[PDB]
Amino acid sequence: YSTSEMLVNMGNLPLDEFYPAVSMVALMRIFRDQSLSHHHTMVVQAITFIFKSLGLKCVQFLPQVMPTFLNVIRVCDGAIREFLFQQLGMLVSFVKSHIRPYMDEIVTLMREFWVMNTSIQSTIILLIEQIVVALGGEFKLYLPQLIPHMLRVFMHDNSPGRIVSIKLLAAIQLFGANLDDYLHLLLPPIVKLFDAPEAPLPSRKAALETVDRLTESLDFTDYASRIIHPIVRTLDQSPELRSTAMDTLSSLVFQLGKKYQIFIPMVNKVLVRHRINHQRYDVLICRIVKGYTLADEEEDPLIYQHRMLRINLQKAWGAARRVSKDDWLEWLRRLSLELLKDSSSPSLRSCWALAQAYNPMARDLFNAAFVSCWSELNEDQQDELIRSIELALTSQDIAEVTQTLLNLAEFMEHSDKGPLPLRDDNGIVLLGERAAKCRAYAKALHYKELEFQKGPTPAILESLISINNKLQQPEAAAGVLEYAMKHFGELEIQAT
């Protein structure tokens, strides 16, 4: 019932944001059915435009799009799923901190489709980097759920050059301080990668880089002996990794205070044997052997980091060449497409492409499209539209075309701008006799009651009797007669 509420705007939402709301319900209806599977490819490219266009005002639409979007990915199969994930990476980069209620299912959904060796590896990895930026500090709530998949990537990877691992090392650097209770189990996989000679050189390069870049936001004092020893058996082994390995070691001696002093003889023998002369590392070692100050030795690395931080519708309307029923249907479909194209709102413009390939989603958007364009036009332009609607209603007898126009009249009455002008009193007399032949007596009775409120006449009273009888309310019709016996002249009641 909420969906039907929005189509009429019962909440009196201002027209500025009314258009995005009515667009989503039209797009979601064609999104919850598996029968229209082929249209799913291009509908999402329009949803991702609405979210981008609005910005910070798209949060209230999250409870509608997300539950259906997540279900679709679970059931859909083929090339669509790999494309749906990239779109899902965009809707999490727009709304940042409000994806928390829906993150539990997203993490679970990513578990099944992350097959160890498949083309869907990078788009999963690229999605992770977009999620961690969005959460930005509270990712640790869901980080442990994706570590079991990530753990067996540094030892079971058949990609040439171990590119997948490199594409994953650059994603670990973005975690920063998010991982604090998971470093005891995530670091041994990292240190295992740059000590194995059989690993390709580019893979070992990033393994050393991802440690020093992670040093800037984490404390590695406790994990000293675990990663210092692999370093000293790497300088002697690889003559090509000497330059970039010292940068990781030197960035770690800085965190440790005077506790590293006992490790100098173990390292100095590797430096005198292989003649390693690193400029930055030479500075730190001198400061420890011979004193510099007292408030600097044995300093907490986290405190040090904190200190450093601190107009064309007439041709569509005025045709007059439509005589056949199919032409009347064709004219309506031509009109509906034309309104969406130029509706003075990017939210409705984006839906024009889908309207060409799907007509039924343009019928429910007729009311929303009309109010956008009609408001912009002045008195002279909008007057020409009214007289074309008059000719449109009093020409044919097809129920489908009239029902669309009859519903449009009701939509305008509910709005705060008042009903659309017509010949006489917003055309109640014309609409009243127009819905009678369409077998829609709920509207016909309402229009007659408006006529009665102006001035009662014998013709109006007789018509109200006929309408109620065919609406299965004999007792209501009996009240009309009693009104005429005492509140109207005598001996005038027709025997019929």
Partner: protein, 479 residues
């Protein structure tokens, strides 16, 4: 009466809607609540410091303390912040700063933080060293620890530790940080003041650990407690380091003390390749102007194990030292004019003492370069204080400039036996002796006393005796 007279002062904290006066203006209603909270706090503190109030507020039956602790667990935000301030004052603990991160609130509680009484105008070193170096008492009973032990035991028995844990894991982000520090201080207060028996149901955190190991409970809460223990873990390291020196004057006092108690208890080849690569990287030569040299690479060159200008007689090193000699020279106004608050204030000062020690190693050769520094410091002293006829203009600048970090250069020379002999040749001890009898200079006198090293017998001790017996009374008080 029993439980209604004295416990009335606890009403503003236990009652969420307290109305002290039946008739008052509604305009200052918000201000009235804050006034009541402050006044009630001074009464609760005032009744926990008297023996007749502790036994009356901690009765075995229903008491006010169980109502004060029981209200701490209710998820209220205005009461919780008020009660935490009371708890800090009861134990006389330093209050942290309001923040949402633990690191910021940890750097504001360390015992070695700067205070306003440590400046040169106030007590220079004696005030600072009182709160850093420990008291020479290992057997004298501290009668205030006994008082704090009884209060701490009373709160632990009633259930303060369990109440704090609920606060940590079920409150705002800026309230939990104030409660995490209080738990850390209390645990440290309790492993050094409480006896053995009271320490068996203490350092186990039963409530906290169970929450941080259970996967059934909501995920959000689990890591709040896990991170809380992680945040509380770093608190011990801050207490592990202890207070550390803040001023280089006090720092050099400790360094000479540990050196002389470790010298009585009976590294690289440094080929020319290492120096030449390092000297060209120092930037002192090719850019003959300061603020461009790499000040990190200069200290390493000086206190490098084998390079001392004597073993390695090199023309380049003669050029290197003389270029640095011109910068620190007091006459050449390139270093003296620097403001007190220059951003690299520390690094520049340490290297200066780090350099005068380098020259002293080359006793036979460095004395020629060392002769120049000591001479113009004497000339600078002869003008600053005003001992010789001069306008005494340097008095205005001495305080606000780095010219006061010159006693560090002359004090670090007194440590070595061959440095005190150098001072006699330059005759700077004679200059220091005369300036003791100076009425209007008191800033000058204070600096000299602290800088000089009195470990060995010689001229140093004599000058100290004159200062502490023949000078201005205010100056003598500090000596």
């Amino acid at each position: 009466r029993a439980d209604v007279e004295l416990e009335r002062i606890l009403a503003p904290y236990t009652d969420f809607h307290y109305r002290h006066s039946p008739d008052t203006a509604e305009g200052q209603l918000k201000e009235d609540r804050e006034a009541r909270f402050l006044a009630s706090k001074m009464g609760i503190i005032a009744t926990f410091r008297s023996w007749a109030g502790i036994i009356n507020l901690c009765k075995p039956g229903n008491s006010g303390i169980q109502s004060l602790i029981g209200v701490l667990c209710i998820p209220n935000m205005e009461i919780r912040r008020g009660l935490l301030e009371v708890l800090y004052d009861i134990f006389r603990l330093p209050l942290p700063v309001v923040t949402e991160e633990f690191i910021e609130a940890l750097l504001s509680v360390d015992p070695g933080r700067f205070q306003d009484s440590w400046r040169l105008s106030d007590g220079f070193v004696a005030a600072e060293a009182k709160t850093i170096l420990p008291h020479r008492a290992r057997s004298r009973p501290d009668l205030m620890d006994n008082y704090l032990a009884l209060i701490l035991s009373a709160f632990i028995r009633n259930g303060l530790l369990e109440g704090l844990v609920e606060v940590i894991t079920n409150s705002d982000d800026h309230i939990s940080v104030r409660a995490t520090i209080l738990l850390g201080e209390l645990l440290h207060m309790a492993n050094t003041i409480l006896p053995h028996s009271h320490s068996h149901h203490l350092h186990c955190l039963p409530t906290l650990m169970n929450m941080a190991a259970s996967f059934d409970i909501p995920k959000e809460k689990r890591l709040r407690a896990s991170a809380a223990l992680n945040c509380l873990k770093r608190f011990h390291e801050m207490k592990k380091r202890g207070p550390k020196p803040y001023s280089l004057h006090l720092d050099h006092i400790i360094q000479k003390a540990i050196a002389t108690h470790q010298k009585r208890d009976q590294i690289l080849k440094d080929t020319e390749e290492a120096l030449l690569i390092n000297l060209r990287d120092s930037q002192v030569l090719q850019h003959k102007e300061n603020l461009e040299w790499n000040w990190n690479l200069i200290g390493t060159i000086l206190k490098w194990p084998n390079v001392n200008l004597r073993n390695y007689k090199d023309e380049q090193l003669h050029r290197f030292v003389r270029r640095l000699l011109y910068f620190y020279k007091p006459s050449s106004k390139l270093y003296a004019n620097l403001d007190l608050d220059f951003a690299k204030a520390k690094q520049l000062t340490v290297v200066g003492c780090q350099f005068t020690e380098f020259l002293l190693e080359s006793e036979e050769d460095g004395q020629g370069y060392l002769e120049d520094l000591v001479k113009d410091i004497v000339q600078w002293l002869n003008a600053s204080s005003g001992m010789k006829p001069e306008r005494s203009l340097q008095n205005n600048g001495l305080l606000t400039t780095l010219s006061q970090h010159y006693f560090l250069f002359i004090g670090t020379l007194s440590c070595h036996p061959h440095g005190v002999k150098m001072l006699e040749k330059c005759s700077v001890f004679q200059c220091l002796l005369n300036l003791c009898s100076l009425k209007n200079q008191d800033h000058l006198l204070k600096l000299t006393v602290s800088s000089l090293d009195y470990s060995r017998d010689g001229l140093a001790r004599v000058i100290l005796s004159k200062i502490l017996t023949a000078a201005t009374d205010a100056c003598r008080l500090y000596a």
